[PDB]
Amino acid sequence: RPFSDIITSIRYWIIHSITIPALYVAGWLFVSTGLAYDIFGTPRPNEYFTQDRQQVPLVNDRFSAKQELEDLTKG
Amino acid sequence: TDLDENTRTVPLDSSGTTVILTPEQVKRGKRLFNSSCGNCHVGGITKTNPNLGLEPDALSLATPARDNIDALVDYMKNPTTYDGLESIAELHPSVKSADIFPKMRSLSDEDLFAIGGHILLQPKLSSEKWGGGKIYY
Amino acid sequence: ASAWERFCSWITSTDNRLYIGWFGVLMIPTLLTATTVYIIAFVAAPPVDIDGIREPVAGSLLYGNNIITGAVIPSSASIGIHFYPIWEAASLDEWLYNGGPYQLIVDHFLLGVCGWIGREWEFSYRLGMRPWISVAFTAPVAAASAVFLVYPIGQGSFSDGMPLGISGTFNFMLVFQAEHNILMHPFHQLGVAGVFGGSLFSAMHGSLVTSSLIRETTENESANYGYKFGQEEETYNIVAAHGYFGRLIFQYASFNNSRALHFFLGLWPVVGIWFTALGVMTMAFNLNGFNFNQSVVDSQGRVINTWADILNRANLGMEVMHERNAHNFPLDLA
Amino acid sequence: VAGRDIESTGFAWWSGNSRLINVSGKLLGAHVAHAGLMVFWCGAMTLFEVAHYIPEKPLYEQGLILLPHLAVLGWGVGPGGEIIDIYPYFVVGVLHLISSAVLGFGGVYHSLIGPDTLEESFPAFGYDWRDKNKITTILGIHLIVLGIGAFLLVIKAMYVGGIYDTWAPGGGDVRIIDSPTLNPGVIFGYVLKSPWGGDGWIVSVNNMEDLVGGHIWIGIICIVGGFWHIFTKPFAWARRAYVWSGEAYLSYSLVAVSLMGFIASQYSWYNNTAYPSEFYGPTGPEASQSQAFTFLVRDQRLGANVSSAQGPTGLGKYLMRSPSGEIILGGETQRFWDLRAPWIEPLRGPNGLDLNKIKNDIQPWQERRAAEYMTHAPLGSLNSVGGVATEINSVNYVSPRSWLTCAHFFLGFAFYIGHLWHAGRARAAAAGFEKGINRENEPTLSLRPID
Amino acid sequence: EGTGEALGIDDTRLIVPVILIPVITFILYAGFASEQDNEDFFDTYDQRR
Amino acid sequence: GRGWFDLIDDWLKRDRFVFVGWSGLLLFPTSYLSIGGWFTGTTFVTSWYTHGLASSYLEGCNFFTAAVSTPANSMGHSLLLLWGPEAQGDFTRWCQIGGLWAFCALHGSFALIGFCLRQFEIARLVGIRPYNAIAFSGPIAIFVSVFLMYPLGQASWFFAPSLGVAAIFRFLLFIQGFHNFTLNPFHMMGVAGILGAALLCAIHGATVQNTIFEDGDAANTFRAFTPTQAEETYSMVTANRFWSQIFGVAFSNKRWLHFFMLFVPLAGLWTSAIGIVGLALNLRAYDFVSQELRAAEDPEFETFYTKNILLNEGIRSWMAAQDQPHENFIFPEEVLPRGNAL
C-alpha cells in the first residue's frame, strides 16, 4: 500500500513508538559499553601509545601480521 | 595513555622542584593560552619574532632561564629581552601593561600559573611539535 | 523611415547569420580585441615579471613553450590591481614586461561574456521564447569573473588571477589549494557534485532517450535519420524510459514529467557552478575551507593524525615551494 | 482558496508570492511584515552581541559585526576606539526589537485581515503597476524618506554627539564634524574616480568631512528628486524605454541592490575610515603592511640598515620604490603600497615613508599596532581557524571584514541573478510569451531560413 | 595611474570625443524619437513604433 | 513455468516495488555488504595500525576525515580474506590490518557488475535498447582503473584511494605530486568529458525549458505536460534558430543530441581511465624533456610548467614522511625543499 497510507496509520506508530527507540538505545549501549573498541580493535583515547610504544604502530610483514598485532596490542 | 601525573608534573622553581598540575589547571591553561597569546604563540612559536620560540630549548637558554613555572610567571609580569637586560613590557603583553594590552587585564596569579603549566606541559606531549613550526604540523 | 530606425532594425535583425543585437554591439568588438591580443601574445610575447621581483616568466610559443606550457602570464605584482592600459606605460616594451596584455584580455573578455549573457537574453526575446538560458550561462561567467577578477580584487593583485594557459591553470589550482584548502571548502564540493551530477544526468538522460527511440529506420541506416527536423511527434517513448528507470531504482524516483526533468537538468549544474564560483569569490577574501588539522588528540593530548593532516602536508609542501623568491616574511598574508 | 491556489491563479505554492503581484493590500502586508523581520533581526542580534561581549578583547576579535556600526556612529566609545560603555548598544537593540512588534503586527494585519486590494477602499494608497504617475509619486515619497535618513546621519555627525574619526589628531576619537566638504568637485570627484588600484572610486574616503558633506549632498539630491517625481510623470523617452510592470520594477531594484551589495563588500574589505580597523579589525593590506613593518622594526633593532638591505632578488627586503617611485615597504607588501592607515601615515612624507622617521622615530605603539594587526589578519577558515589554510587548530578567529565582504559579495551576485531572472520574465510577460511558444503562431516558422 | 582624474581624463582633449560622440548619436536618435507617438499609454510596454 | 528453473525465473522477474531479477542474486548481497561495510569501517574501524591515522567517528573523526583506509603496505596485494594467512579468521586483527577496505572494494566491484547486469536485464525485459548499461561502463572503468589496477601496478593496496572524503582529497594531491597527473593528456580528455557533459546537461535543460510550447494558461508550466502525449513539448526549430544565430551551430536532430549527451561523459571517463592505467606503472606524462634541458642549461628560463614541477617536488618531500609511515622517511629540515621565508 502507498507509503503515506502506512505512515499516517496509527498501527504503524504503535509499533514504532517502541521498536525504533529500542535499537536507537541499543547502539548507545553498544558504544557506551566500550564493546565497539573490542570488536573492531579501535584504540580508545588512552590506547594510541604506551610504554616503549610512544611511536606509531605499524605492521611490517604480511604473514606474521597477527603475531605482531598481538605483540603491539598486548596492552 | 591517560593524562597521568608523570605528564602533569612540571618544574616549578629554578632549583629543581616540581609541581603536579591538576586537570582543571591544564584545561584553564590551554584555554587561557589559546585566548590570550595563541594569535602570536600558536604551536609554541613566535610569529612576530620567530628567532625566540617557546620550545624548552629556548626557554632553558634564556637569561634568566624560563624553563619553570616561577620564571615563566615572572616573565608574564616582568618581560625582558632574551638576555634579561632590557624591559620589553611596552612591547609584550604583561599584567603590568594591561591597559595597552587589554587581554592581560583579567589574568590572576592562578591564571598565570596555569598558562605556564600549559607551556611546560606541551613539549611533553609531542617530541617536536611544540615550537617545531610548519615542519611538524 | 529614419536612418536610426533602419540601423536599429539591422542590429536587431533576425536575418543576419549571426545575431548581433545591442549586446552584440558591445560583445563583438570586445571579444574580437581579446581574441586578437590573446593570439598575438600567446604566439609571441616577451617574458613577464609576474611576481614583481624582476624574474620574468616565459609564456609565449616563440620563447620556448608548447601549447601545454604556453600562457599569457598574469600582470606584475608591482602593478597590483592598478589599471594598466597601453597608454599608462612609458613604452610598449615595458607594458609587455609587466603583463599588461593579461589585463587587456581579461577586461575585454569579461565584458564580452557579460555581453554574451545579455545577447542570449536578447535573441531569446526576438524569437518570442522564454528567457533564462542566459541565467544558465551566468554560472560559467560567474566562475570566470571569480578567477580572473574577484580573486585579484580580494588578494589585491592581478598577478593572482589565473594565467591564460594550461600549465598556468594547474599552477593557479595548486597555489589556491595550498593557500585556501579549496577541496575542503564546501562550495567547491558542491561544484564537484554539480559537475559529477551533470555528467551522471547527461549520460543517464542520453542513454534513456537513445534507448527508447521509436523504430523509424531500416537496418542499413543510422537510427538518427528516424527523426526529421521540425516534426510534430515525439522521437522516443517517454513511457518506456520512465518505466525502465522506475524498475531500475524505484517508481517514485523517476521523473514522469519531462519539463520537470529538463528543469532539473538545467538546475543541478548551474547551481553547483554558482556555488563553486561563489566559493572562489569568498576565498578571494580569505574565508578558507575547513581546517581540521590536529582535531583528534589522545587522552594525554598528543595529536593523532587524520586524513586532514595528511592533506595538510601536501598543502604545506605546495605552500613552501610556491613563489620561492617572492616572500621575505614567514606569513603569507598577501 | 480563491487567489491562493494554482487553479485560480496559475502559480504553484513554490511561486506563491507571485500571487501577490496584483493584490496591493496583501502585498503591502508582505512588505511590512518582512520589514518587521529586518528590524527584529537587528534588535535581537545586537542584543546577542551585547550579551556575548566581554570587555577584555576588542570588537573585531570577538566576532562582533553590528556593535562596530554603533561605535562608528559615536556611541559608547572613547579615545583610541576603546568601547567604554555598551548601554547605548542595548538601547538601540531594545528599540529595534520593540519596533519589530509594531511592524510585524502591521504586516500580519495587512496580509491576513486587511483589505486585499487598496484600490477601492483607499484610493490614495491604491495603485496599478501600469499607472506611471502614481508609482512615480510613491518612488518620490520613498526618495524623500531616504534623504531624511541621510540628513539623520548628518545631524548625528554634526550636532548630536558626532561620529568616530579614526584620523583624528592624536588617537582616533569621537568628534564633531563641524566643516563637511560641500564642494561638488570633491563629492562628485569621488563618484567619477576610477575603481582600480590607488583610486578606489567611493571606497577611497580618507576623511569624515568628505563623508558627511557627501551625505548632505545625497540628502539634498534625494529630497529634490522625490519632489521632482511627486510632481512629474515619466518623459516620453523613458516611457518607451522601460517595462511598466511590478516584476520589472522588482528587477530594477534587484540590480541596484546587487550593485550596492558589491560596493558594500569592498567598503568593508578596503576602507578603514567608515570601517575603522580598531572595530572591524585590520584590512588585508593593513595586515600585510603591518607584517613588513614589524619585521622592519625588528631587524633595524638588531643592527640592520633597512633602507640598504638587499632581498633575495635584488629588491628591497624592507624598503623599496613603488612603480611611481614612492618609498614603500618591501616584500609581497609591494602590491599593498596604496594602504593609508592612521598608524602608518605618521611616518609618511611627501615622497613616501620618510627614512629619517622610519629609522629614528618609530614609536612603540606603532610596533604594538603592527604586531596586533599582523597576528589578526583576515585569513581564516569557515570553521573559524585563524591564520593560513595550513595552520593548526589553536586560534579561533575570522575577521569581521572577511565575513561582511564574503556575505555581501555573495548576496550581490545572487541579486544580480535575481535581476536577470526577473527582468527577463518582465520582458517576456509584457510581450506575452512567458508561458511558452504558441503552437499556432510560432515566430520561427514565419522567419526565412538562414543559410 | 592612481591619480584620481574624473573618468581618467588627464588631458582636456579626451573630453571632445566623450561629449561629442554621444551628441551625434543623440542627434541621430532624436530623428527616431520625434517620429514616434509620444502620448501616454496604459500598458506594460509601448507597441507603437 | 512448470519447471523449477522456470518457477525461479518467474519469481525473480516479478513486477513488484523492487525488481530483483537474476542479477539481484549478485547485486543485493554484495552491494549491501559494501555499503554497510563502509558504514562500519568509517564508524568503528581505525587506520592506526595501517596508516597511523584516526579514521572513525569513534576515534573522533567527522564525515570528512572518516574513511575506510587502505590496508597496510606490508600486505602487498593480498586478497585479505578473513580466513587468509594474514588475519587467519580473527575479525579484530582483520579490521586492524585494513582488510575491511579489501572487503568493501572487492564487494563493490561485484556490486557494480551486478548493477550493470541489472540494467541489461531490465532493458531486456522491458524491451528497450541497452544504452544505459553501456553508459555505466564508464563508472565501471573508473572504479576498476582507479581502485583495482592502480594499486595492483603499485607496491600494494596501500596506495589505492582510501574510501573517504579527506582520504580522496589526499589521493588527488598525492597523485598530482607523485605523477603530475594534470599534465597527463588522458586526464585532460577526461576533465574535458566531465565539464562538457555538465555543459550539455545545463544547456539542454535550459533550452528545453525555454522553448516549451504554450500548452496551458498557468504561469507555472510544469503541469502543462502529459506523459503519454504524442506531441513534442518544446520547439526544436526555435531552439535550433536560437543556437544557430547565437553560437553559429546548433543541434537539428534530437537523437544525435541525446547520443552526444551520452557519449561525452562516457568518453571522458574511458579516456581518464587510460591515463590512470598508465599511472599504475609510473608511465607518467611527468615532464617535457626539452624544457627540462633548457632550464638546466638556462637558469633564467622559467615557465608555469617548471613552477608546477617545483610544487610537485614540495608535495612529495613534505608528504612522504607522514603519508608513507612504513618507509620510515626521516627528512631533516636541511634536505626538505623550501623557499625563502615561508
Ligand code: CLA
Ligand atoms: C518574508 C516572508 C514572507 C512573507 C512576509 C509572506 C507573506 C505572505 N504570503 Mg507567503 N510565502 C513565503 C514567505 C513569505 N510570505 C515563503 C517562503 C513561501 C514558500 C513556501 C510562501 C508561500 C506562499 C504562498 C503559497 C502564498 C503566500 C501568500 C502570502 C500572503 C498571504 C498570507 C495568507 O493569507 O496566508 C494565511 C496564513 C495563515 C492563516 C497561517 C498563519 C500564519 C501566521 C499569521 C504567522 C505568525 C506570524 C507571527 C508569529 C505573528 C506575530 C503577531 C504580532 C502581533 C506580534 C502574505 C502577504 C498567499 C498569497 O499570495 O495570497 C494572495 C499565498 O497563496 N505565501
Ligand code: CLA
Ligand atoms: C508601509 C507602511 C504602511 C502603509 C503604506 C499603510 C497603509 C495603510 N494602513 Mg497601515 N499599518 C502599518 C503600516 C502601513 N500602513 C503598520 C506598521 C501598522 C501596525 C501599527 C498598520 C496598521 C494598520 C491598521 C490597523 C489599519 C491600517 C490601515 C491602513 C490604510 C489607512 C491609513 C490611514 O488612514 O492613515 C492615517 C494615518 C495615521 C493615523 C497616522 C498619523 C501619524 C501618527 C501621529 C504618527 C506620527 C509619526 C511621526 C511623524 C514620525 C517621526 C519620525 C522621526 C522618528 C524621524 C492604508 C492602506 C487601515 C485599513 O486598511 O483599514 C481597512 C487600518 O485599519 N494600517
Ligand code: CLA
Ligand atoms: C531610487 C532612485 C530613483 C529612481 C528609481 C528614479 C527613476 C527615474 N528617474 Mg530619476 N532621479 C532621482 C532618483 C531616482 N530616479 C533623483 C534623486 C534625481 C535628482 C533630482 C532624479 C532626477 C531625475 C530627472 C531629472 C529625471 C528622472 C527621470 C527618471 C526616470 C528615468 C531614469 C533613467 O532612465 O535614468 C537614466 C540614467 C542615466 C542616463 C545615467 C545617470 C547619470 C549619472 C550621473 C551616472 C554617473 C556614473 C555612475 C556613478 C557610475 C557607477 C554607478 C554604479 C552604482 C553602477 C525614472 C522614472 C526622468 C523622468 O522622466 O522624470 C520625470 C527625468 O528626466 N530622474
Ligand code: CLA
Ligand atoms: C540575511 C540578511 C542580511 C543581514 C542579516 C544583513 C546584515 C547587514 N547588512 Mg545587509 N544586505 C543583505 C542582506 C542582509 N544584510 C542583502 C540581500 C543585501 C543586498 C545585496 C544587503 C546589502 C547590504 C549593504 C549594501 C550593506 C549591508 C550592510 C549590512 C550590515 C548593516 C545593516 C544596516 O545598518 O543596514 C543599513 C540600515 C538601514 C538602511 C536602515 C535605516 C537606517 C537609518 C536611516 C539610520 C539612522 C542613523 C542615525 C545616526 C540615528 C540617530 C538619529 C538621531 C538621534 C541623530 C549588516 C551586517 C552594510 C555593511 O556593513 O556592509 C559591509 C552595508 O553597507 N547590507
Ligand code: CLA
Ligand atoms: C527583492 C527580492 C526579491 C523579491 C521581492 C522576489 C520576488 C519573487 N520571486 Mg524571487 N528572486 C530573488 C529575489 C527576490 N524575488 C533573487 C535574489 C533571486 C535569484 C536567486 C530570485 C529568483 C527567483 C526565481 C527563480 C523565481 C522567483 C520568483 C519570485 C516570485 C515568487 C517567489 C516565491 O513565492 O518564493 C517562495 C519561496 C520559496 C519557495 C523558498 C525557497 C528558498 C530557497 C530554496 C533557498 C535558497 C537556495 C539557494 C541557497 C539559492 C542560491 C542562489 C544562487 C543565485 C546563489 C516573487 C515575485 C518566482 C516567480 O514565479 O517569479 C515570477 C521564480 O520563478 N525569484
Ligand code: CLA
Ligand atoms: C552475492 C554474493 C557474494 C559474493 C559474490 C561474494 C564475494 C566475495 N566474498 Mg563474500 N559474503 C557474502 C556473499 C557474497 N560474497 C555474504 C552473504 C556474506 C555474509 C555472511 C559474505 C561474507 C564475506 C566475508 C566475511 C568475506 C567475504 C569475501 C568475499 C570475497 C572472497 C570470496 C571467496 O574466495 O570465498 C571462498 C569461495 C567461495 C565462497 C565460492 C564457493 C564455491 C562452491 C559453492 C564451493 C563448492 C565446495 C566444494 C565441492 C568443496 C570440495 C573440497 C575441495 C576439494 C574443493 C569475494 C569478493 C572476503 C573478502 O572480501 O575479503 C577481503 C571475506 O573475507 N565474504
Ligand SMILES: CC1=CCCC(C)(C)[C@H]1/C=C/C(C)=C/C=C/C(C)=C/C=C/C=C(C)/C=C/C=C(C)/C=C/C1=C(C)CCCC1(C)C
Ligand atoms: C524589554 C526587554 C528587556 C530586556 C531584553 C528583552 C529582549 C527581554 C526585551 C524584551 C523585548 C520584547 C518582549 C520584544 C517584543 C517583540 C516582538 C513580540 C516582536 C514580534 C515581531 C513580529 C514579527 C517580526 C512578525 C512578522 C511575521 C511574518 C513576516 C509572518 C509571515 C507569514 C505571513 C505574514 C503569512 C504566511 C505565513 C508566513 C510566511 C509565516
Ligand SMILES: CC1=CCCC(C)(C)[C@H]1/C=C/C(C)=C/C=C/C(C)=C/C=C/C=C(C)/C=C/C=C(C)/C=C/C1=C(C)CCCC1(C)C
Ligand atoms: C562489515 C562486515 C564485516 C564482516 C561480516 C558482515 C556481514 C557483518 C559485514 C557486513 C556488515 C553490514 C552489511 C552491516 C550493516 C550496516 C549498515 C547498513 C550501516 C549503515 C548505517 C547508516 C547510517 C549510519 C546512516 C546515517 C545517515 C545520516 C547521518 C544522514 C544524515 C541526515 C540526517 C540525519 C537528517 C537530514 C539530512 C541528512 C543528510 C539526510
Ligand SMILES: CC1=CCCC(C)(C)[C@H]1/C=C/C(C)=C/C=C/C(C)=C/C=C/C=C(C)/C=C/C=C(C)/C=C\C1=C(C)CCCC1(C)C
Ligand atoms: C554618500 C557618500 C559617501 C562617501 C563619500 C562620497 C563622496 C562617495 C559620498 C557621495 C556619494 C554620491 C554623491 C554618490 C552618488 C552616486 C550616483 C549618482 C550614482 C549613479 C548611478 C546611476 C546608474 C547606475 C544609472 C543607470 C541607469 C540605467 C542603466 C538606465 C536604463 C537604460 C538606459 C539609460 C539605456 C539603455 C536601456 C536602459 C537599461 C533602460
Ligand code: OEX
Ligand atoms: O603572488 Mn600569487 O600569490 Ca596569493 O599568496 Mn601571497 O601573494 Mn604570492 O603568495 Mn601565496
Ligand SMILES: [Cl-]
Ligand atoms: Cl613577503
Ligand SMILES: [Fe+2]
Ligand atoms: Fe530531451
